[PDB]
Amino acid sequence: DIKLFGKWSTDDVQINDISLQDYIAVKEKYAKYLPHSAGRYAAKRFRKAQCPIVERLTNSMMMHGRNNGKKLMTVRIVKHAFEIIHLLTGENPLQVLVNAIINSGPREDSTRIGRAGTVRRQAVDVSPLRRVNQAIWLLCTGAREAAFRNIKTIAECLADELINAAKGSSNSYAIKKKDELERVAKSNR
Amino acid sequence: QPIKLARVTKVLGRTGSQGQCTQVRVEFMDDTSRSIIRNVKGPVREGDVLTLLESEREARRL
Amino acid sequence: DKLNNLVLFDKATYDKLCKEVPNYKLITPAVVSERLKIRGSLARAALQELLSKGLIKLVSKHRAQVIYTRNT
Amino acid sequence: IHRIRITLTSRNVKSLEKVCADLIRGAKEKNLKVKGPVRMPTKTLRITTRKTPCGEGSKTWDRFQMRIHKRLIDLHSPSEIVKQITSISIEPGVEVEVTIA
Amino acid sequence: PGVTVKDVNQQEFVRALAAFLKKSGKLKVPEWVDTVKLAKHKELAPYDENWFYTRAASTARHLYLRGGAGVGSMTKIYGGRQRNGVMPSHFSRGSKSVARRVLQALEGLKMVEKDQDGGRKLTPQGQRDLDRIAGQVAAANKKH
Amino acid sequence: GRVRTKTVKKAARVIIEKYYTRLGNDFHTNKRVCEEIAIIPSKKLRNKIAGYVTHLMKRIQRGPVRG
Amino acid sequence: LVIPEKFQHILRVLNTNIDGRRKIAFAITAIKGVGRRYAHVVLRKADIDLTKRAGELTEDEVERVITIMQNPRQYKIPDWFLNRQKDVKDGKYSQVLANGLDNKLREDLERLKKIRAHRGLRHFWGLRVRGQHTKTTGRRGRT
Amino acid sequence: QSVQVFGRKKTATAVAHCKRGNGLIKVNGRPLEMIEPRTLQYKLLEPVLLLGKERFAGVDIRVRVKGGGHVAQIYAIRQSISKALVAYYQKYVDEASKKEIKDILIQYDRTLLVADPRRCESKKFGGPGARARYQKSY
RNA sequence: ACGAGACUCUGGCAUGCUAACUAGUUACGCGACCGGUCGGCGUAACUUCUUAGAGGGACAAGUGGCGUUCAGCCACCCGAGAUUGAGCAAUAACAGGUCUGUGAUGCCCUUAGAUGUCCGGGGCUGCACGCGCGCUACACUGACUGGCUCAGCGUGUGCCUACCCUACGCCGGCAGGCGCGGGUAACCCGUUGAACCCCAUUCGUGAUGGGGAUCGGGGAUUGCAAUUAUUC
């Protein structure tokens, strides 16, 4: 087979970015089944870029030190809630995933300029990689806080967080804090 | 606030207080007759595309 | 903080469960325990009873992660 | 009996290997069934210690290291030939022994 | 083309072994089941009330895998990290009394026999019974 | 981080200035001739010297070299 | 099926009101002797339905629990498992769980207080007598 | 009949002996798809799902795995299997079949034919971890 | 010229070579399964995984571009490796520390009302707060029944060196016991059956079962003595 997890279709992926697809793309022969191939992607600049999105996003689950390096839990926790998402939504655990991340990544940030600038900042464009990495962390942080002292468990916060991100709702922590940072930047333009 | 794409043609340099911005020249697709200078935040590449929220704004050059 | 949940059969536990609980599209022990505010022990007992009846479909089983889908 | 072993224990690899090659060549010269140089796993003793005499300054630990090596060679021969081939002007600093089965 | 002793899920294979043994009911239990702590890392009392059957089945499986597992091998199979609270924990061997009682309970019941190298091994009749169990449980869902 | 020390550069210059005829353009032959006609007490040093010798041969073909 | 009679949310063991919202074998931990592995042992030797809920527990089962826990001689459980092994005053090895006397047994320092031992003096000052360093640490409990 | 090509991952290793037989594969004297974690079963199963079962229906491969660490024990089984097939085909049958299988796997995954260069770095003194040092007093 | 680099040690490659019956493929009742998994055996091929020796191998070497077309840098083919990690580490100095290592010590204090091994009898295990190097913790990211399949470095039974790591049978919850005990070594520990997890009762959203951090009581092995239970 060539499908993700043997159930997720590989052929109905959409461009959906025209020319930003080069950094969010799962359509090649390297798109493997189980997102677990050790940590050889963080060894050189943009050798992470050729990695498929599913792999990096399941990698970004292990935070807080208590669950550091528990990639088995991460792949199980992604397989669960993937077998859920499409189910509750209906599309393709993939297409929904790319749409959710694209909707959860900021596009404009604020940076200080000059040798001694200490009063004002300036608006700057955000590169694909930076926003995607940040968005994945936001999604993971939202899942963690929906699983922290809350009635919801792991491998389930991710599903509804991704559904909200695809929907564009303010329920998800990701896009709501994206909007907060965007408002800060807009006041800082 | 329209959003448009422009192709990177020459990565001019790296600036910023501690250094976080890449100043780069981008040529628009739909015109190809006008190019601008933008400081993109985050790891950027050569020949890729960048999403700008404002086309009338340019960062400091040199 | 504190969450007082009933730990015995009562009027609310059995009612709106034969249809309205599988009437949703997403059913899990977390989902049922949240949309009914009952302990997961009796919820899992009812789920096992219904599975022995064979009207809901299991996707995953665990002591902390069980997945159900409508089969009626 | 035809069950004779010889044991060469040392610290340097060059002198021990030259001695082993000399012994194997000499035992090959006479028509002997000799087992080749068996290399026992070298053992290195690690000693991380204080550098300063009195505790003062930075915690710099001297990792003194001694590696020792052992070779065992079996051969089926008259023991008189074993004695006559042992005294072949062996290298200083190598300990050579003869073991019976 | 024959049947493999380990072609089944070892978890479900050992569960089938426990079910077969408790259907047989031959293996006895000692009088006390509440005195022994049963694990230097344990925090409470075991919640099975039948852990002797599972222990015997698992130990017979282990003796099938390899022999010589005498008094000194079993205690370190389940022995492990022992929480000392604030102190960094350390490895502690399993309780020797209950392990020795298990060794005496498995002995003398026509499944475990003495071997030249010490410890004990599995009598071939028990191996044939386990192979029959494995074949049946394979035909249950793996051969249909 | 692949700048050549003056030992390698000077040895390559001397070898090229004395033994132009023997050496060629393939590193695996320059290393052999260099180890033949020189006392190089290390394999790594010989590899570095031969690599810079091959680079110097690629330099001379396009024109005379200053050094 | 389920029991509609006798249903009480309180299991009175020592004229006390314990929380019934907790499941069995864990809610009874509140007693000064019953709890942790002690409760597990007494309910395991009680031979009752440990898989049932606390609400479905009947009066007869709590009565059986009281009978088994009153007599450590009911099932020949050795004395060392108990906390009052090798008792003071008189050699005592049975079990009696009751309020108003258990704290006096806890007040076993007064006997050694009367012997003015080093342990007695250390107990007088409220310090950790097991050799714990109290040089300047220990700021909790003094405001 | 036997190539014994082995395969490495961390300090752990796996040896896949390949012979002419029924085509069935055994690992640790056991069938293939019942490994207890059941999480990375397809990770080691990749060769079959990539090259097809027919390429795996003419060689009997017995794989033995030894080395500390359970995740280190896995990730060498599939590399050993691929290397065993490559060596067996090159030694016995012809070049073209092994060429196609190696080309397909490499275009899929490069790691299936070459070992991992990564290994655990030593720990230098003055700190709790490998690179990390003790907390300074300021 | 010194320092840097080179260099020494270490690892990423050796189906090329010298090779062992301590570790081991491939090898037929013996121990068995309706042609197949099973550390109980022995010679055979003589080394692939196993150990360590000679070597060899990587050189910004081969392409694309940038570069005062230089020194170099950035990507790709190939390759095990396209920056493995340490050791050593220069001028000249600090009134830095060490006279509590010195039987290396100078000069004052010494020269018995001593400034030592002798009872160890005697103490930093004494407390009204803060700075200074970590672990448990905050859980439905996991405590939790066990089903489990697997390590690396190495000290290890004594020309005054008594102190050694661990299997058979039994006892006991625990410290241990007795007969030979396996250890001149990869033969013995041990196919080091260690940490998480693939599951098995509770918790199903917590002050509790985790936090046992503070007070009761039971035992052993080197201890003339373990009180201020230091030790399990």
> Contacts of residue E2 in chain H, CB cutoff 8 Å?
none
Q: Give the Cα separation of C26 and A81 in Å (integer).
A: 11
Cβ proximity of H69 and H12 under 8 Å: yes
Do G5 and G49 fall into the same domain?
Answer: yes
Question: Within 10 Å of residue H137's Cβ, how many Cβ atoms?
Answer: 4
Domain that holds residue D72: 1-101
The type of residue at B46 is E
Q: What is the CATH number of the domain that holds G23?
A: 1.10.8.50
Q: What is the CATH number of the domain that holds D44?
A: 3.30.70.600
Cβ proximity of H62 and H29 under 8 Å: yes
Q: Give the Cα separation of C59 and A150 in Å (integer).
A: 23
Which residue, among G102, G95, G93, G94, has the nearest Cα to G32 in the 3D structure?
G102
Most distant pair of Cα atoms in chain D: their distance: 65
Which nucleotides of strand I come closer than 7 angstroms to any CB of the protein?
Answer: 4-8, 10-13, 15, 18-20, 22, 25-26, 31-41, 48-54, 56-62, 70-73, 75, 80-88, 96-101, 125-136, 138-155, 166-176, 185-186, 190-191, 193-218, 227-230
Q: Which of residues 117-136 of H touch D (CB under 8 A)?
A: 125-126
Q: Give the Cα separation of H109 and A36 in Å (integer).
A: 13
Sequence-distant (6+) residues with CB within 8 A of A83 are: A5, A7, A93, C59, C60, C67
Binary contact (E4, H31; C-beta < 8 A): yes
Q: Give the Cα separation of A112 and H33 in Å (integer).
A: 56
Which residue, among B37, B41, B42, has the nearest Cα to B25 in the 3D structure?
B37
Residues in chain H: 138
The fold of C3-72 is Arc Repressor Mutant, subunit A (1.10.10)
Sequence-distant (6+) residues with CB within 8 A of H49 are: A1, A33, H42
Q: Reduced to 3 states, what is the DSSP secondary structure of residue A121?
A: strand
> Tokens 């009947």, residue?
G58
Look at strands D95-100 and E87-92 and give their pairing: unpaired
Q: What is the CATH number of the domain that holds A18?
A: 1.10.455.10
Measure B19 CA to I74 C1' (Å). 20
Do G95 and G60 fall into the same domain?
Answer: no
Binary contact (C26, A155; C-beta < 8 A): no
Determination technique for this PDB entry?
A: cryo-EM
Which residue, among H2, H12, H13, has the nearest Cα to H80 in the 3D structure?
H13
Resolution (A): 2.7
Q: Which chains have at least 3 CB atom pairs separated by less than 8 Å from chain C?
A: A, G
Question: How close, in Å, is residue H31 to chain E by CA atoms?
Answer: 6
Single out the residue in G21, G43, G78 at which a domain terminates: G78
The type of residue at A69 is G
Measure C16 CA to I210 C1' (Å). 37
Q: Which residues pair with D4 in a beta bridge?
A: D75, D100
The type of residue at E80 is G
Binary contact (H126, D48; C-beta < 8 A): no
Domain count, chain A: 1
Full 3-state SS string of G90-113: CCCCCCCCCCCCHHHHHCCHHHHH
Q: Give the Cα separation of C39 and C28 in Å (integer).
A: 13
Question: Within 10 Å of residue H93's Cβ, how many Cβ atoms?
Answer: 13
Helix runs in A45-92, H state only: 53-59, 71-82, 85-88
Domain that holds residue A62: 4-187
Task: Kindly state the tokens that stand for D80.
Answer: 């008189």
CA distances from A10 to A93, E18, H44 (A): 10, 44, 21
Q: Give the Cα separation of H24 and H43 in Å (integer).
A: 18
Domain that holds residue H117: 1-138
Q: Give the Cα separation of G66 and G79 in Å (integer).
A: 18
Which residue, among H63, D86, B25, A163, has the nearest Cα to A171 in the 3D structure?
A163
The whole-angstrom distance between residue E132's C-alpha and the CA centroid of its chain comes to: 19
> Contacts of residue H116 in chain A, CB cutoff 8 Å?
38
Give the residue from chain E lying closest to G40, CA to CA: E45
The whole-angstrom distance between residue H131's C-alpha and the CA centroid of its chain comes to: 30
Write out the E strands in G1-143: none
Domain count, chain G: 2
Question: How close, in Å, is residue G115 to chain E by CA atoms?
Answer: 33
Do G9 and G61 fall into the same domain?
Answer: yes
Q: What is the DSSP letter of B51?
A: E
Which residue, among C13, C26, C16, C35, has the nearest Cα to C56 in the 3D structure?
C26
Give the residue from chain H lying closest to A30, CA to CA: H108
Binary contact (H34, E11; C-beta < 8 A): no
Sequence-distant (6+) residues with CB within 8 A of A68 are: A62
Domain count, chain F: 1
Cβ proximity of H90 and H76 under 8 Å: no
The number of C-alpha atoms within 13 Å of H45 and in the hemisphere containing its C-beta is 18
Core vs surface per residue E64-99: b (16+ CB within 10 A) or e: beebebeeeebbeebbeeeeeeeeeeeebbbbeebb
Q: What is the CATH number of the domain that holds H128?
A: 3.30.230.10
Domain that holds residue G121: 79-143
Look at strands B21-28 and B35-41 and give their pairing: antiparallel
Give the residue from chain D lying closest to H124, CA to CA: D61
Q: What is the CATH number of the domain that holds F8?
A: 1.10.60.20
Which residue, among E137, E132, E139, E135, has the nearest Cα to E11 in the 3D structure?
E137
Residue E4 touches chain H, beta carbons under 8 Å = yes
Q: Give the Cα separation of F35 and F44 in Å (integer).
A: 11
Q: Which residues pair with A110 in a beta bridge?
A: A123
